[PDB]
Each structure stands twice: as structure tokens, then as C-alpha cells.
Amino acid sequence: PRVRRSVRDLQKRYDNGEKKPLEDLVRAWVGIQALPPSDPKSFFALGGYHGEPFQYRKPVDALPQDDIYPYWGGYCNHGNVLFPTWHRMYVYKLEEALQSIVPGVSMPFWDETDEYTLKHGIPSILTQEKFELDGKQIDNPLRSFVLPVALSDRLPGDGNIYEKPKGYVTVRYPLSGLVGTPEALEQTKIHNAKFPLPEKNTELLNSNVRAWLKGDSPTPGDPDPTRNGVYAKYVRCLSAPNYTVFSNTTSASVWNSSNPGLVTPVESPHNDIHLAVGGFDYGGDEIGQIAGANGDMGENNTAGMDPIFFFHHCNVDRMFWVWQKQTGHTDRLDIIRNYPGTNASDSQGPTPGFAPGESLNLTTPLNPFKKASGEAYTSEDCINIERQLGFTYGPGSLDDATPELKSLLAVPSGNSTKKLTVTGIDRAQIQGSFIMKAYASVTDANGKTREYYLGHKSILSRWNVVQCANCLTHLDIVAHFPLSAMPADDVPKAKFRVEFIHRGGGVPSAAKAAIDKVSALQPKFEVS
Amino acid sequence: APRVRRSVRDLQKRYDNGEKKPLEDLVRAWVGIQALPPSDPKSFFALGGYHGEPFQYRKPVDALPQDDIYPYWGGYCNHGNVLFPTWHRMYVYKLEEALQSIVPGVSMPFWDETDEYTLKHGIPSILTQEKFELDGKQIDNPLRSFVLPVALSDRLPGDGNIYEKPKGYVTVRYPLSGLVGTPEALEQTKIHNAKFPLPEKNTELLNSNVRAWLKGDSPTPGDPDPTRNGVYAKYVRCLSAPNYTVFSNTTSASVWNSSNPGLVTPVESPHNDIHLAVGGFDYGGDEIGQIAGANGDMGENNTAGMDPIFFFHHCNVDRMFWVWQKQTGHTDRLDIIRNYPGTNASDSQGPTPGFAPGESLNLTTPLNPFKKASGEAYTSEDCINIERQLGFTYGPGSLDDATPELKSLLAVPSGNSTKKLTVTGIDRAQIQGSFIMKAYASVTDANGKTREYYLGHKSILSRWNVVQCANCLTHLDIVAHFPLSAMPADDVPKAKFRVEFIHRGGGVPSAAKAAIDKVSALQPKFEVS
Ligand SMILES: [Cu+2]
Ligand SMILES: [Cu+2]
Ligand SMILES: [Cu+2]
Ligand SMILES: [Cu+2]
Ligand SMILES: [O]
Ligand SMILES: [O]
């Protein structure tokens, strides 16, 4: 049974004399990036499966505003119960291509919650410019990917924000990569000119990733993860009561509207990391509403084209394995039938070959992945990673439940165990990912006022190219926040607010309308 | 001074003892409403029309390939969503307003489907009777059926479909059939209805079928004796629904029953059963075959609205809503679990006109096409309290008290199973018309011999569809829950379960063979909780 390890581990081993592990990893990645785009083991093909390049439903795209519905032209499952197992298979399938080059090689995980990441950000092997392979200096293949062919719909006369030219290089925070219209490219050029130094950019990113994990501005001593950060949310997720609500944000959201307390699906901190690496400043609501760093990882469209997507998803799979171990679901999973999250119409809408209204279950095929026999993989094929897929997860953060982790999530004596529901944000238009941050102020009769931060919600979403003015996806926003930061007697005095950080329509001609709508929103606040 | 909606059976008792001015007012009002011209939004044609047909279409959705198409509803009524109880509340209210425009002050009464009369004798004859004595001349009874004053027609050149019904079409109930819009359908309807030429006999068959439904078995003489499986038991169970969301509709109740121990019955469920009883399904149909050929107006949502008994039945559904409102403390407040199945326009029948696929339904959303004095759309907010907001109440009637009897009818007998059966493995079914599922269990002991248990019924009240590919019908995943309270707890793990279907056979002889084969080829999947 092969072991997948912490990549920080492979890097320490490299710096201490033992280099074949990191060198094997790099060699295999060089190998798959060099395969041609038409080869289904090429990194371009593999990154392609997630999102773009898309398959369209032209009859749906022409529907009027009252009849149109959202769908997904990529194969990835998001906001549904196939989120964990589809990505499980996806990483496994890219490991298979790596093995094409270097037999027996294992895909490590970026351990997002280890001590190194809390204190120093992303392991440098994922950001370094260069690497020593066969005593030669090569370009580090994990830093980014150059597109061998264009992402293009090849429609004569047309260019949209989905499209990226041949030679396009993937980018992370703080850079922008939306280049398919003249407007987006121009704004991208202006935005990137504000971040011209690669070394400074790497620092900015490491600092944002630490701030996301912490849940507040990074401290220079020991890490001190608060209850609101991505550390806390990954911990909370290992307590999800059942697979259905562990698995996705649609299921967990309705569970949290219908049951006491709060569950966190693994998809939730996973969304957090996307936005962190992919262009959102945790502190962004102290500055403005618009996150202009349109990086590949920040939306599902081209996230799969960035190598770090697989190191991150390797850690997401890890967390799913750990949840399986700690809750005894190593061999069997269950789905609440017809629960929100089990429908192809949920969230991103249906993937290719699915229809509106169609159920999703453990037998549903995880396209486009196929076995040696040519038969479609299903969730049944990949529940026990040791038994059916032939690999395990080495040791890393969070794999044991402990007193320290229990006291992190726990309500300070005399603080509210209640929860806040934010709604009244009905039928908002979706262009790109966005974040919500909730706060509370309380004012005494004597006039003193305290301020409370209640936490964040990351909606990982997509770019959308539509055929009419008002034909974007509509979404009801619903968000639940703990009140644990507040003392219980302040809750009835409280005045709540939310701040959004969003894409502003993707381009400058869409920005003022986006800002006006968000500023106009009058959310409803409900205390349990 | 809240007006009093009464039992129509009570109004007939009083007519027979010489107090005739209440039932004469009702009938007078229904005559006046049926004689208004069709363009008048108070004409029974327009009121009946609001529920379903005449349809508003979404021509670009009708044109979609089979992978992209989705169901939608061209009528205004809400079914399988949280607006079912409140939309229909306002529909009955608005019909009542129309009646009042003909006879000031009149109250729309309710067919008490669960009183001792209905259990023993079926429908009160005031609703089935051919004739009625008003102002000296004996008139046609407007409550027994309705004549269309204009066609239900899409007026398309060269086309005719099962939605369409000619001017002069008369609504029908079990045992008659009423699909007439293609030649095959009209032929079958003529042949079928000619087997049933006597009105008196037809009424007896209807009353017998209604009584069978209510009971859960063949109607027995004397003490009606409802079982745990009948529509009586189901209405009783719906008053224990833990919240409004799952009380309100079949979609919410279904997901609840998949995700909580025990069994909830929404009010829409017994309501569905009455529709099918009156609109063409024989409770004991599964002893005869799979097809229910009596295509009555009440049996599908398409034209049910045009049969006057719709409003007597729904007046009782509203009463049951009120009774649940009374017994659970929601006379003044309702709430909806946010994003729960049943809170989306995409659910069940699909979006009504105006609405968009993923759009949410709450106590705020307009109950089209109903409108107050101020031209502003009604909402559920406007009709939570019937006493304070609408100025009417429900007089006494069956089931309005919790009662030892009711308890030990739904009670699990001693040693019998408290477990639940879940029926599954029936995915992507094509829907043409309403259908019924009936669940059974056999148990062979070691001594070779076999017992049979009836576990109950599930009515899917649905719709006739007209589509533009063979493969393009609405697809439904069928999930059903049945109690095992009928069988002894130690018989359960030995049990071999089965379901039978009674369905419309595609509506026409030419679709019947295909439909029978598809059903016979289902391999349902069974699970015990
Ligand atoms: Cu993904
Ligand atoms: Cu991801
Ligand atoms: Cu209805
Ligand atoms: Cu009805
Ligand atoms: O993702
Ligand atoms: O209905």
C-alpha cells in the first residue's frame, strides 16, 4: 500500500541529503506537462477535465431570462455529494499519469494545517522559480503551467473571459489572469503592474494564506489560530455527523437551517483555500469590495490548470480519509435520499450528460474517469483507498481529535452558543467567487460600543459568459455564523452587518453596477 | 362576526327538514357564477381556468432536447411545494368572493370527507344529483358537473392534443372518462363511457370507490370501520405533522421521512387520494390490471379545476389546514425551513408562470393570480389567520379534536413492527398522468405456509403532458415510505416486499403496451429502517 506524504516532508528530506523523492515528483510533473494536449495523461488534458475547456448546451444558453438555468461544462462536482469522491478520483487519475513517467511515484499533499504553513505559508517547493534535476537548472513545474494550446471556443469573431491564449501562464494571488476580452486583459495588465516583483508577490501570498488559516492578521511568534480561521474550519469539518453534510456546502447549509448548532462540510475550508491562493485578501473588507486578482485557482473555470490545485486537493482527500477513519466510514458511505446536495440541478447545475432534476448517488459515474476495463468509475469504486485504490495517507496535521482542538471550537464560558442566520439576499447575480464576513456591534445605554467578528463564508464559484443582460445565474445567499465570540448578554443588544468581497463583474464596465447592488442589499438577521 | 363555512352534509340535513334557504342560496350562487361569460374573472370558467388549463406555455423550454428539458406548470396552482396549502386557501376564498357577487353573504361549505356519512354512504347526493328545485322550476344541478362555454384549445393549425376539450364538453367523475383531444382518446372515451350509461349506477360506483378509499379496504356494512391504511387514517395522521413545511406538501414530507425516524403525512397526501378516487382510480384496481382508463377531470391537475366538487373538496382541505393550525399553535404564525425540498419553484410540477427554475418560495411570494382591493398580489402572509385576515371560520366537523379513538387507530398493535419500509430503485420513470403505488409483504414461515400483509398506498396526483420527443417526458425518481405497523415484528426480517402500480397507461391505447412493459420491468429496491 503506497503512501502519499506531506510535500514539506519531501522538501525537508531534500535539504537533508535525500533528494530522490522530491526529484521523482518533479521529474514526473515535467513528464506529464511535456506530453501533447491530445494525450489524456497530459497535464493540459488532466487540468482540462475540471472546468474549461467546456462542453456547452446551446439550446439552454439561448433560453430567456425566466427559463434559463445554470449548468457546468466541466466534469468537476461542486456543491453536491459527489464533491469528495469525484475529486478523490481526479487526484488518483493524475497520480496515474505521473506513474506513466516515473513508476510507483506518489502524489503528496500540501499539509495546509501543519505548523510550517501556519507560520510560513506555502512550502517553497510549490512557489520556487527553479529546480535542480540531473545537476541541471530547470523551470520548477509546480510554480505554474504554460498552456500548450489556447483555451478557446474557436468561435469566429468572438472572444470571451473563458478564453486564454496559447502561452498563457497560470497565476496566483496577487496577480490576475482574466484575459479573454480586451477590457479584461487591459484591467489585468493594469492590476498586475501594481505587483511587479515575483519575490514580493510570493511574500504577499504566504502572508494571505497565513491570515486565512489564522482568521486574523498573522502574528510573529507562535501561530495562534482563532476560532474563525481556516484551521478552525478544517477541524470543525472532521466532526460532520454524516457523509451527506460532510461532503458539500448545499447539504450543510440546509442541515444548519434545520438543526441546532453548526456543521462545516470539507468543501467549505476547501473553498477558503481556493480564494486565498486564487485572489482574495482575507483583510480585503478593510480596503474595498472588489478582489481584482483574478487568479486561476479563485474560480472553478481554470483552477485545474494550476499545479497547486492537486497538492491542495490531495490534502482535501486526506481530510476525507481522516473523517472516514475517525467516524468509521472507511468502507461504506450513506446519502440522505433527495436531500439538497443529491441533485444535478443543485449549485453549479448539471455536468455534461446529466439532466435537470437528475439524482446523484454512489453509483453515479464520475466522468470522465474510466477503469482499465473501459467502465466508468463510481463512488463505490473509491471509498476505501487502501483496499480499492491501493494507497494510504502518511501522517500529518489534524489526523487525531484532541483536547486542544476541542477547546479551540468551544464556546468560552458565558459566551453565546446561539447562531446567526443571514438571508434577505435573494436572487443575486453571480460573476465569480465571493466572500461574506459577518460582524456584530453592541452599544450600551452609557454609549460604549464593542465590535465582534463572527467569521467568514467563501462561495467558490465561476466566471459566466451569457447571451443576455439579465441571464446570469441567480442565487439566494444564506449564511450561518457562530455567535461564540460574543458574551451572551450582548446578543439581544446587537446590530449585525455583513461585508462582501467580490469580483465586481470581472471587468471595469461591470464594476459600478456590482458595487451599487451590494451596497443597496438590506440583509435580514435572525438569531436562533 | 366571523362567517361560518359549514358541512354541506349539514346543509342538506337542514334542507330536508324544511330549512332550505341556505342550500338554495348556495345553488343560486353557483348558477350565477356558471352563467357569467368566460372573459369575466368571476365566471366559473375563468376561476376553474386558473388552476391549470388553459395553459401559459414556455415555448423555448418545450423545444429543449431530452437532456436539457425540465418540467414546468402552465397553470397557477402550487403542488408539491410549501405554497400548496396557502395558494388553495386563496383559491377557495376567491371562488367564494365570486359566489358572494351573485348572493351577498353566502358561505362556501366543505365536503366533510371524513364524517360518518361519507364513510358509510360516500358523497352527499347534493353534489351528484342531476336536479335541484330552485324558485319553482327544477333546474340542472350546477354542482354535479360543468359544461365548458368555450373550448380548451391551443388554436394551433392542424394540431390537437390531450389538453384540448371542445366547447360543450361536460366534466366527468369516476367511473367515466374525459380525454377527448385526439381521435384515439375520444374513441376510447366513447367506448369506455358507453359501458356506464346509467347515472344512478355511476353514482353508486363512485360512492363505493370513495368509501373504499376512505376505509383502506372493501366497504363493509354497518360500522364503517376505517383501517390504518385508508384516507381517514391519512387525514388523521396529517394533523400530527411536526411543522408547516412537512405538513404542507409531499416533497417536504418525503425528504423528512427519509431523514427522520417515524412517518409524516402532509395534508397534500390525503388530498391527492381524494382526487384519484373521484377522478378515476379504483382503490382495488391492482387486483384487475395496471391501467385506470376512467380519465376523469379531478384525476389530474389539468382540468380538475373545472369540476365543482374541486371546491367542496378543497374547502375541506383548507379546513384541515385550519384544524392543524388550531391544534399546533400556528393560527397566527407559519415558517418555512429555508432551502428545504418543497421551497423551490423547480420542485415537483416545476415553475408556475412568472417564476424561474431555481427561484425560492416563501410566505412572501405572490399567489398568482389572486389580488386584493389595492391591485396588489396576495401572499401567504395575507391568509395565515382566516378569522382575523379573511373574516370567516370553519364550523364544527370531523377530526377537529384529538381523541383516544384516533390514537389507538394509528397505534401500533402490541408486538407489531414500529419500523418503516422505503421503496426505491425506481429511477427516471416517465410520467403521463397520475398513478398509485400499493405496497405488500409476503412471509413464508418454516412450516411452509405464507401470510400476506397490506402496508398501504401512495397517490401521485400529476398531470397529462404533451411533449415533442418520445423520450422527452418529465422523469421522476419514485421514493415511497410505508409503515410496517401491520405485521408482527418478528415477521419483518423474513418478509419479501412488492409494489403494484395503477397508472394511466399513457392515456391512450397506442401508449398502453409500452407503459405496461416499463412498469412490469421495474425492479424496486426495499429497505427497512
Ligand atoms: Cu473542483
Ligand atoms: Cu478545489
Ligand atoms: Cu391544486
Ligand atoms: Cu386538489
Ligand atoms: O474545486
Ligand atoms: O389539487
B135 Cβ contact partners less than 8 Å away, ≥ 6 residues apart: none
Q: Report d(CA B397, CA B10) in Å as an integer.
A: 9
Q: Which residue has the cell 378509499?
A: B213
Q: Count the helices and strands in chain A (H runs, E runs).
A: 15, 12
Q: Are A51 and A303 in contact (CB under 8 A)?
A: yes
Q: Report d(CA B343, CA B336) in Å as an integer.
A: 8
Of A57, A64, A359, the CB nearest to B477: A359
DSSP letters, A210-271, are HHHHHTSSPPSSS----TTSHHHHHHHHTT-SSHHHHH-HHHHHHHHHHSSS----THHHHH
Residues 409-428 of B with CB under 8 A from A: 422, 424, 427-428
Q: Are A364 and A378 in contact (CB under 8 A)?
A: yes
B248 Cβ contact partners less than 8 Å away, ≥ 6 residues apart: B81, B82, B83, B84, B85, B266, B267, B268, B342
Going by C-alpha positions, the residue among B206, B375, B217 that lies closest to residue B287 is B217
B314 Cβ contact partners less than 8 Å away, ≥ 6 residues apart: B88, B91, B92, B271
Q: State the CB neighbour count (10 A cutoff) for residue A369.
A: 20
Going by C-alpha positions, the residue among A269, A294, A318 that lies closest to residue A458 is A269
The verdict on whether residue A456 carries a ligand-binding annotation is no
B517 reaches A (C-beta below 8 A): no
Q: Are B278 and B313 in contact (CB under 8 A)?
A: yes
Q: Report d(CA B281, CA B277) in Å as an integer.
A: 5
Mutate: best of B58, B59, B62, B64, partner A, most A CBs <10 A: B64
B502 Cβ contact partners less than 8 Å away, ≥ 6 residues apart: B281, B282, B285, B286, B290, B291, B292, B435, B436, B438
Q: Are B325 and B400 in contact (CB under 8 A)?
A: no
Cross-strand partners of B420: B483
Residues of A with CB below 8 A from B360's CB?
A: 426, 476
Residues of A with CB below 8 A from B426's CB?
A: none
Give the Cα-Cα-Cα angle A414, A419, A420 (nearest 5 degrees): 125
Please give the distance, rounded to the nearest whole angstrom, from the Cα atom of residue B304 to the centre of ligand 4.
8
Cross-strand partners of A164: A151
Alpha carbon separation from A246 to A257, A354, A466 (Å, rounded):
15, 23, 33
In the three-class reduction of DSSP (H, G, I as helix; E, B as strand; rest coil), residue B144 is classed as coil
Q: Are B279 and B173 in contact (CB under 8 A)?
A: yes
In the three-class reduction of DSSP (H, G, I as helix; E, B as strand; rest coil), residue A18 is classed as coil
Q: Check CB contact under 8 Å for A355 and B67.
A: yes
DSSP state letter for A134: T
Q: State the CB neighbour count (10 A cutoff) for residue A168.
A: 20
Backbone angles phi, psi at A259, to 5 degrees: -145, 155
Torsion angle (degrees, nearest 10) of CA A120, A126, A129, A133: 120
Q: Report d(CA B133, CA A242) in Å as an integer.
A: 65
Label each residue of B501-518 as H, E or C.
Answer: EEECCCCCHHHHHHHHHH
Q: Report d(CA A483, CA B439) in Å as an integer.
A: 48
| The three grid cell numbers given for residue A194, joined into one nine-digit string | 501594481
Paired sense of beta strands A449-459 and B392-394, if any: unpaired
Q: Report d(CA A29, CA A42) in Å as an integer.
A: 10
Q: Are A309 and A144 in contact (CB under 8 A)?
A: no
- In chain A, which residue's Cα lies nearest the Cα of B353? A66
B297 Cβ contact partners less than 8 Å away, ≥ 6 residues apart: B171, B172, B173, B178, B279, B303, B304, B306, B307
Chain interruptions in chain B, by residue before each (C–N > 2.5 Å): none
Q: Report d(CA A12, CA A62) in Å as an integer.
A: 54
Q: Report d(CA B175, CA B435) in Å as an integer.
A: 16
Q: Check CB contact under 8 Å for A426 and B360.
A: yes
Q: Report d(CA B20, CA A527) in Å as an integer.
A: 56
Half-sphere exposure of A17 (CA within 13 A, CB side): 0
| The three grid cell numbers given for residue A447, joined into one nine-digit string | 454609549
B289 reaches A (C-beta below 8 A): no
Backbone angles phi, psi at B323, to 5 degrees: -60, -40
Going by C-alpha positions, the residue among B15, B125, B96 that lies closest to residue B318 is B96
Backbone angles phi, psi at A415, to 5 degrees: -95, 160
DSSP state letter for B180: -
DSSP state letter for B291: B
Q: Are A179 and A165 in contact (CB under 8 A)?
A: yes
Going by C-alpha positions, the residue among B73, B265, B269, B278 that lies closest to residue B174 is B278
- In chain B, which residue's Cα lies nearest the Cα of A479? B338
Residues 165-224 of A with CB under 8 A from B: none
Backbone angles phi, psi at B4, to 5 degrees: -120, 110
Q: Report d(CA B462, CA B77) in Å as an integer.
A: 12
Instruction: Indicate the helix (H) or strand (E) that contains A86.
Output: helix A83-101
DSSP letters, B258-276, are HHSSS----THHHHHHHHH
| The three grid cell numbers given for residue B493, joined into one nine-digit string | 426480517
Q: State the CB neighbour count (10 A cutoff) for residue B239.
A: 20
Instruction: Indicate the helix (H) or strand (E) that contains B137.
Output: strand B137-140
Q: Check CB contact under 8 Å for A257 and B340.
A: yes
B339 reaches A (C-beta below 8 A): yes
Q: Report d(CA A53, CA A43) in Å as an integer.
A: 13
DSSP letters, A36-86, are -TTSTTSHHHHHHTTSSSP---HHHHTS-TTT-----SSS---SSTTHHHH
Separation of first and last alpha carbons in chain A: 48
Q: Which sign does the torsion angle of CA B177, B181, B185, B187 carry?
A: positive
B269 Cβ contact partners less than 8 Å away, ≥ 6 residues apart: B234, B238, B250, B253, B458, B459
Going by C-alpha positions, the residue among A146, A79, A522 that lies closest to residue A343 is A79
Q: Are A339 and A244 in contact (CB under 8 A)?
A: yes
In the three-class reduction of DSSP (H, G, I as helix; E, B as strand; rest coil), residue B354 is classed as coil
In the three-class reduction of DSSP (H, G, I as helix; E, B as strand; rest coil), residue B315 is classed as helix
In B126-267, which residue ranges form alpha helices assigned H by DSSP? Answer: 183-194, 199-215, 231-238, 244-248, 250-259
In the three-class reduction of DSSP (H, G, I as helix; E, B as strand; rest coil), residue B322 is classed as helix
Q: Is the peptide bond before B404 cis (omega within 30 degrees of 0)?
A: no
Q: Report d(CA A484, CA A410) in Å as an integer.
A: 8
Q: What class, spelled out in words, does domain A2-404 have in CATH?
A: mainly alpha
Q: Are B108 and B99 in contact (CB under 8 A)?
A: yes
DSSP state letter for B371: B
User: How large is the C-alpha radius of gyration of chain A?
Assistant: 22
A228 Cβ contact partners less than 8 Å away, ≥ 6 residues apart: A215, A216, A453, A454, A455, A456, A485
Instruction: Tell me which residue has its CA closest to atom 1 in ligand 5.
Output: A300
Report the greatest alpha carbon distance in chain B: 74
B337 Cβ contact partners less than 8 Å away, ≥ 6 residues apart: A254, A257, A258, B243, B245, B252, B343
Backbone angles phi, psi at B481, to 5 degrees: -120, 135
Residues 466-485 of A with CB under 8 A from B: 474-476, 478
Going by C-alpha positions, the residue among A185, A190, A149, A142 that lies closest to residue A166 is A149
In the three-class reduction of DSSP (H, G, I as helix; E, B as strand; rest coil), residue B376 is classed as coil
Q: State the CB neighbour count (10 A cutoff) for residue B158.
A: 4
Q: Report d(CA B264, CA B284) in Å as an integer.
A: 24
Q: Are A356 and A62 in contact (CB under 8 A)?
A: no
Q: State the CB neighbour count (10 A cutoff) for residue B5.
A: 23
Torsion angle (degrees, nearest 10) of CA A33, A34, A36, A41: -50
Q: Report d(CA A123, CA A117) in Å as an integer.
A: 7
Specify the amino acid at residue B283: Y
Q: Report d(CA A493, CA A443) in Å as an integer.
A: 7
Q: Is the peptide bond before A241 cis (omega within 30 degrees of 0)?
A: no
Of B70, B341, B428, the CB nearest to A338: B341
User: How large is the C-alpha radius of gyration of chain B?
Assistant: 22
In the three-class reduction of DSSP (H, G, I as helix; E, B as strand; rest coil), residue B235 is classed as helix
Q: Check CB contact under 8 Å for A355 and B61.
A: no
| The three grid cell numbers given for residue B242, joined into one nine-digit string | 411536526
Half-sphere exposure of A190 (CA within 13 A, CB side): 9
Burial tier of A315 (Cβ tally within 10 Å: 0-12, 13-18, 19+):
buried
Alpha carbon separation from B145 to B31, B126, B130, B137, B210 (Å, rounded):
12, 12, 9, 19, 17
Q: Check CB contact under 8 Å for B337 and A254.
A: yes
Burial tier of A219 (Cβ tally within 10 Å: 0-12, 13-18, 19+):
exposed
Please give the distance, rounded to the nearest whole angstrom, from the Cα atom of residue A78 to the centre of ligand 5.
7
| The three grid cell numbers given for residue A486, joined into one nine-digit string | 460574543
Burial tier of A415 (Cβ tally within 10 Å: 0-12, 13-18, 19+):
middle
In the three-class reduction of DSSP (H, G, I as helix; E, B as strand; rest coil), residue B492 is classed as helix
Interchain CB contacts (distance < 8 Å): A and B: 100
Separation of first and last alpha carbons in chain B: 50
Q: Report d(CA A206, CA A200) in Å as an integer.
A: 10
Q: Report d(CA A333, CA A355) in Å as an integer.
A: 24
Cross-strand partners of A131: A138
In the three-class reduction of DSSP (H, G, I as helix; E, B as strand; rest coil), residue B424 is classed as strand
Specify the amino acid at residue A279: G
Cross-strand partners of A365: A378
Q: Are B114 and B210 in contact (CB under 8 A)?
A: no
Going by C-alpha positions, the residue among A90, A136, A108 that lies closest to residue A24 is A108
Distance from chain centroid for Cα A490: 34
Instruction: Indicate the helix (H) or strand (E) that contains A452.
Output: strand A449-459
Q: Report d(CA A528, CA A164) in Å as an integer.
A: 47
Q: Are A467 and A62 in contact (CB under 8 A)?
A: yes
Find the ligand nearest to A313 CA: 2
Q: Report d(CA A206, CA A117) in Å as an integer.
A: 9
Q: Report d(CA B377, CA B379) in Å as an integer.
A: 7
DSSP letters, A334-360, are ---TT-TTSBTTSTT-PPTT--TT-B-
Q: State the CB neighbour count (10 A cutoff) for residue A130.
A: 10
* Domain ranges (residues) in chain A: 2-404
Specify the amino acid at residue A153: D
Q: Check CB contact under 8 Å for A339 and B477.
A: no
DSSP state letter for B378: P
| The three grid cell numbers given for residue B178, joined into one nine-digit string | 374525459
Cα distance from B342 to chain A (closest Cα, Å)?
A: 11
Inter-axis angle of helices A308-327 and A267-278, nearest 10: 160
A70 Cβ contact partners less than 8 Å away, ≥ 6 residues apart: A348, A349, A430, A473, B358
| The three grid cell numbers given for residue A195, joined into one nine-digit string | 505587483
Find the ligand nearest to A89 CA: 1
Q: Report d(CA B155, CA B231) in Å as an integer.
A: 40
Backbone angles phi, psi at A137, to 5 degrees: -85, 115
Backbone angles phi, psi at A268, to 5 degrees: -70, -60
Alpha carbon separation from A229 to A204, A216, A410, B396 (Å, rounded):
18, 7, 14, 59
Per-residue b/e over A146-162, b at no fewer than 16 CB within 10 Å?
ebbebbbbeeeeebebb
Paired sense of beta strands A524-527 and B137-140, if any: unpaired
Inter-axis angle of helices A308-327 and A230-237, nearest 10: 40
Q: Is the peptide bond before B54 cis (omega within 30 degrees of 0)?
A: yes
Specify the amino acid at residue B266: P
Please give the distance, rounded to the nearest whole angstrom, from the Cα atom of residue A217 to the centre of ligand 5.
26
Alpha carbon separation from A325 to A127, A329, A393, A405, B380 (Å, rounded):
32, 6, 11, 17, 47
Q: Report d(CA B491, CA B453) in Å as an integer.
A: 10
Q: Are A367 and A354 in contact (CB under 8 A)?
A: no
Would you identify the CATH topology of the domain B3-407? di-copper center containing domain from catechol oxidase (1.10.1280)
Q: Which residues surround ligand 1, an ion (CB under 5 A)?
A: A 76
Q: Which residue has the cell 432534476?
A: A357
Q: Report d(CA A49, CA B7) in Å as an integer.
A: 64
- In chain A, which residue's Cα lies nearest the Cα of B359? A427
In B195-249, which residue ranges form alpha helices assigned H by DSSP? Answer: 199-215, 231-238, 244-248
Backbone angles phi, psi at B447, to 5 degrees: -65, 20
